């Protein structure tokens, strides 16, 4: 139902991590060790794909990585965090509303079909020690644009490649809506400067790889606030900066941007995801909150992840758990209660971008 | 008009609020008092995160209730 993707550089990080464990240079963090502890095979007996899937399976439905993660092995190690932040996941979705936050959402008369690509932003906040992403992209406390570009390129390019080819297979082009990934909770102390850095990173990826993306057409970048409206031709692509908090009446994230429609385009929305969380994060705890939780709640994301058939609620703009679950219950009925009760795990097929820019198996 | 308590991981913020105040409204009052942007505020009550677009009333948050702010 969903597809996990990662870069060639991340695949190298995983192979090195496995080898590092087998050579005794590292020990698994508690939550990885917990998933590993359920296995009959040791680490040296696993192949790279199983190993990767079990590290991804250590994610929890809801985690607040900017505040309640310690990066010291009592939950995850930095070595695991460097991998998990690079993992993205896509899935087909029904979009029941336009993705407006809070009470601002507008329901679609007939729900539209499209795709989500969950991608974790740079984790530039922490409750405890420095994060992997802080070490990667900060030079003595200062944001390095080229390093941030490289990070987002590593994380986003596999999804752009995936939907370039899927638009081709569907004989359409792709329209992609993108939020201000990493500019909210994950921005930490960089809240006040991060907005143009993320915009610049998106422009650099598209310009650098434009010749690999002939079926990508329109990019709708909506940072919400902190950026100015703009439109830029990037190769063949139309890249629009459209902050819906400063311009009124703009298209939502879960809606066709101007110039696209269901006949000519597939609609894909990027979700600002989270290193240690299942897709949707906040909404597993019933909160239709943040880009991640809003987009999950406003789609059938939870059905694609759990395999269950939920019910959309027009009043609260929300895909709810199945009636066969909520009906008898006197309490504790949100999607995370559904996963605890049914032993659901987050484990799916994984592909990696290879030397030639093709998605393929990890071996 | 009433008062609630927002505990941090700690320094307890006292807020002046109305049952009809939305969570974003409450978050904005926290910003005025503490300088934390709403985008970087997670508010928990009775073990659940409070979401934009609902009101204190919706969560049955009454006078002198304690909320928990999660910060980096
Ligand atoms: N009322 C609003 N309406 C629409 N967009 C908004 C609003 N307020 C802010 N934005 C924009 O929404 C955009 C993204 O804000 P965030 O979701 O925090 O981005 P991140 O990647 O830093 O946080 C990711 C973490 O939060 C989740 O829990 C994930 O699971 C991660 O744990 C910003 O550009 C805001 O301008």
Author numbering:
A (entry chain A): 42 to 404
B (entry chain B): 0 to 8, 10 to 72
What does the paper say about this structure?
The intracellular bacterial pathogen Legionella pneumophila modulates host cell functions by secreting multiple effectors with diverse biochemical activities. In particular, effectors of the SidE family interfere with host protein ubiquitination in a process that involves production of phosphoribosyl ubiquitin (PR-Ub). Here, we show that effector LnaB converts PR-Ub into ADP-ribosylated ubiquitin, which is further processed to ADP-ribose and functional ubiquitin by the (ADP-ribosyl)hydrolase MavL, thus maintaining ubiquitin homeostasis in infected cells. The activity of LnaB requires a motif consisting of Ser, His and Glu (SHxxxE) present in a large family of toxins from diverse bacterial pathogens.
Further efforts using these mutants allowed us to obtain the structure of the MavL40-404(D315A)-ADPR-Ub complex at a 1.93 Å resolution (left). The combined surface area of the interface between MavL and ubiquitin is approximately 867.6 Å2. In the complex, ADPR-Ub engages MavL in such a way that the ADPR moiety linked to the side chain of R42 of ubiquitin is inserted into the active-site pocket and the binding is coordinated by several pairs of hydrogen bonds provided by G223, G225, C226, F227, K236, P264, N322, D323, T331, D332, and D333 of MavL with D39 and R42 of ubiquitin. E107 and D323 of MavL hold R42 of ubiquitin in a position suitable for catalysis via hydrogen bond interactions (middle). In addition, the side chain of D323 points to the 1”-OH of the ADPR moiety and the -NH2 of R42 in ubiquitin at a distance of 2.65 Å and 2.69 Å, respectively, thus is most likely the residue key for catalysis (middle). Unexpectedly, the N-glycosidic bond between ADPR and R42 of ubiquitin was cleaved in our structure, which may be caused by the residual activity of the D315A mutant. Comparison of the structures of apo-MavL, MavL-ADPR, and MavL40-404(D315A)-ADPR-Ub revealed that the side chains of several residues, including F105, C226, Y232, and Q330 are involved in the formation of the activity pocket of apo-MavL that faces outwards, keeping the binding pocket in an open state. ADPR-Ub was detected in cells infected by wild-type L. pneumophila and its level was elevated in samples infected with the ∆mavL mutant, and complementation with MavL but not the inactive mutant MavLD323A restored the phenotype, indicating that MavL functions to reduce cellular ADPR-Ub.
